[PDB]
Amino acid sequence: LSVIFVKPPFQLKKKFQKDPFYEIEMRKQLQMQQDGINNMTIFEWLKNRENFKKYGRSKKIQEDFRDRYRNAKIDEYLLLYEDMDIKAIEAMVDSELEGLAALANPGRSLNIENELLKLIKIKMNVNLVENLEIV
Amino acid sequence: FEKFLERSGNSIKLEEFSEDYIRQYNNLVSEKLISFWRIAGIGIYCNGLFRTIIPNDYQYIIEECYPMYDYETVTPFMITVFGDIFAYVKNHVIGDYVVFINIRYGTFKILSENIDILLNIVIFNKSCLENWFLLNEYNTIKEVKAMPKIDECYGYVPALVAGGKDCIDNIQIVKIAPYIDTVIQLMGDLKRI
């Protein structure tokens, strides 16, 4: 189809420029990634993208505070049952009715995706390698 | 770390750490992590699955994808054969923790600050390897692919963030640093697991 240019262009950030060999390897990576994308049908690229958005998901201090408390409880089980199923450990920790239980339980690729969606057997057609921004 | 040394298959310690170098992390990481540095050095452990790396060589790229409060410091210390990253986070308000950054799926996971349990127990527990680190396919990948050296990893081409399929056919041995840099520039912010 029509050629989708990555927005914004990739960067060669300044910290990595002190090493003259880095840019070369970067360009190699960007090219091998571009061919890998262009080798896919549009349907399967969209399939994988929406699958990818399923992994993972307030105030971070409060979430980490709770996770620290929970991890100390998980650690108590790991110390005793080194080979126990961690899903079981987690469920037991999360089932206690005091302690932890007091604590309330609280994009370069996406741009290519949005440009492609408004463009809509047929192969993806993206450019990653042009316009590498230096600095 | 007798347990870590006994349970790691085919360990290769590529180098010891300079003491002057690791002691500048005295106030940034736990005594436990420093003792582990002295034991493990730079090397490849657990039949190639984990590598201990030079922290300052990974410092910039972790600050690129891991957002922090101004009272936090992050110190990378270990990677997976896929280029996932373990780092120790010094946090003066809530206390310390370890963060596991999964470069394939664009997530981070808050782990316990206790390096002793992580490295003598957790990384040998099959269900943690599967459910925490998504490392369960390793023995299957490693019969069909050579061992990446300490500056390489199993990269997906194209990256899973870039629409690639998660299969052994899309894995290539790539240089880890430009790969991780490219994956991060492809993804939005990391998501909490």
Numbering used by the authors:
A (entry chain A): 162 to 218, 222 to 270, 303 to 316, 329 to 343
B (entry chain B): 2 to 194
What's the publication's text?
Tde1tox interaction with Tdi1 increases thermal stability (melting temperature 67°C versus 55.5°C). A Tde1tox/Tdi1 dissociation constant of 18 nM was measured by biolayer interferometry (BLI). We therefore obtained crystal structures of the Tde1 Ntox15 domain in complex with Tdi1, as well as a homologous complex from P. vulgatus dnLKV7, Tde2tox and Tdi2. When bound to immunity proteins, Tde1tox and Tde2tox split into two subdomains. There is an ~32 amino acid region disordered in the crystal structure, corresponding to β2, α6, and the surrounding loops in the Tde1tox only structure. Notably, this disordered region contains part of the HxxD active site motif and most of the DNA binding site. Superposition of the Tde1tox alone structure with the Tde1tox/Tdi1 complex indicates a conformational shift characterized by a hinge motion, as well as an ~180° relative rotation of the two Tde1tox subdomains. Upon immunity interaction, Tde effectors undergo a dramatic conformational shift, highlighted by superposition of the Tde1tox alone and Tde1tox/Tdi1 complex structures.
We identify a horizontally transferred T6SS with Ntox15 family nuclease effector (Tde1) that mediates interbacterial antagonism among Bacteroidales, including several derived from a single human donor. Effectors with novel toxin 15 (Ntox15) DNAse domains, also known as toxin_43 domains, degrade recipient genomic DNA.
